[PDB]
């Protein structure tokens, strides 16, 4: 699953950045 990239991976990364 390391090779699966989609919109949801962005939003989780922007969320992590915001909340930390």
């Amino acid at each position, epitope marked *: *699953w390391a090779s*699966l990239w989609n*919109w*949801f991976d*962005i*939003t*989780n990364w922007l969320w992590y*950045i915001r909340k930390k």
Partner: antibody
Amino acid sequence: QVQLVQSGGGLVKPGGSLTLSCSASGFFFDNSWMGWVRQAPGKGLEWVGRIRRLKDGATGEYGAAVKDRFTISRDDSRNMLYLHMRTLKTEDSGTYYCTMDEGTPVTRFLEWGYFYYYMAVWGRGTTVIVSS
Amino acid sequence: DIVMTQSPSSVSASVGDRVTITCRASQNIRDYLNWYQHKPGGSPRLLIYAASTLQTGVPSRFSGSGSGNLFTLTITNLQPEDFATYYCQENYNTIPSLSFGQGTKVDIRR
């Protein structure tokens, strides 16, 4: 070109169970969120539920009318989406469409983590009739 | 928790006319709104997400506007294939409700 073909469903008496199936082709099933939408005869559209990728936890989320009764599941090796309907009611009759959902990240900093969510590709629909 | 009410439920028009469907939300939903086209005996078709962003492949005759709790779908130079039923949908709650409007069918005026 995206191709969704649905099967399953049909006639069943109230209180019974019924499984719908949606076969995907033309896109990366494993990397896509999927779901279902239904339309009772003479009525409008009504979201039923969605399911996430396996890596996202394969989380099944359902609408109020069907939560606790309908369950969604996926098969990434077979590229199949299933809608398991149990304890059916006459008001569950209608045309069920399986959908290929996708999202777009929101860029407004204060909403980082949120996404637009929509059904980008809809199947031809399968008819469900709950009657004795 | 979110209720969507479209208006009008029906509207008639001739080809080449400007059609304006409005969609109202029971609360503020920013720009988390979709529009769908549904022709009878056919699969629903996504037109607009993010309230105003056109989906790839949709004609530019369709434009989405509005923000908060009042949204509008406009179809300029109405065409024969555009005679169908249109729905709006909210996608605001993190716990998805994804509630549609009752729908709006566009008929041919005569």
